């Protein structure tokens, strides 16, 4: 649904939400669109192993450098492994093929580091069945200013390094959650931002998001 996201961003940006009359950003909030999942923590160890991350439900995942993925559900034991060719298999930390020993060890290190050392993004929010299929990290990249995280449920999260602000874009809800410098977490319907406007700070970040979605679309493999 990246193409849908691109269309939704074209539409909001074309409405020039910060450049017209009275901004009524609060009227664009839609609590029914609060995301179910976002990335709460991440560790870039890609020069050796991969990108580890925690989702807001306390599950963790790793996208390894060989393009395989391991997902640990928040029960702390149930695992999903996704091979290069896309085959999904289910196992546990306690019961797994010997061939997965190294990758499970790596996941445990990532999980323990994130639990001990990093702040949980969106920590005050209850999100929207903890064994139901989790989204996984489809791809990610970094720029000088941000990390861009594309989840398999279509959501795209952009974390800006310098000011700690974040966007969570969902093309199914056609919504964006903005986490500002004060850690206020607010979810907007994109078409209501068109209707009611928004501040220049959110508008600028939505222009950046469109450029990042074009990058995702032009680099999918």
């Amino acid at each position: 649904h990246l193409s849908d996201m691109l269309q939704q961003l074209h539409s909001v940006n074309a409405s020039k939400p910060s450049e017209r009359g009275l901004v009524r950003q609060e009227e664009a909030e839609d609590p029914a669109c609060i995301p179910i999942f976002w990335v709460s923590k991440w560790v870039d160890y890609s020069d050796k192993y991969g990108l580890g991350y925690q989702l807001c439900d306390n599950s963790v995942g790793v996208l390894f450098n060989d393009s395989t993925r391991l997902i640990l559900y928040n029960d702390g034991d149930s695992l999903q492994y996704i091979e290069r060719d896309g085959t999904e298999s289910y196992l546990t930390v306690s019961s797994h093929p010997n061939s997965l020993m190294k990758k499970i060890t790596l996941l445990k290190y990532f999980r323990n580091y994130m639990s001990e050392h990093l702040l949980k993004a969106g920590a005050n929010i209850t999100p929207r069945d903890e064994l139901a299929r989790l989204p996984y990290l489809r791809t990610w990249f970094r720029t000088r200013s941000a990390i861009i995280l594309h989840l398999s449920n279509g959501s795209v999260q952009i974390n800006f390094f310098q000011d700690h602000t974040k966007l969570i874009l969902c093309p199914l809800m056609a919504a964006v959650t903005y986490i500002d410098e004060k850690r206020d977490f607010r979810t907007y319907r994109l078409s209501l931002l068109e209707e009611y406007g928004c501040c220049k700070e959110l508008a600028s970040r939505l222009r950046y998001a469109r450029t990042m979605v074009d990058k995702l679309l032009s680099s999918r493999s």
């Binding site: 990335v39 923590k41 991440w42 560790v43 870039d44 160890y45 580091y113 050392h117 990093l118 702040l119 993004a121 974390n159 390094f161 700690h164």
Partner: peptide, 5 residues
């Protein structure tokens, strides 16, 4: 940065 906040 090589990890989140």
């Amino acid at each position: 940065p090589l990890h989140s906040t």
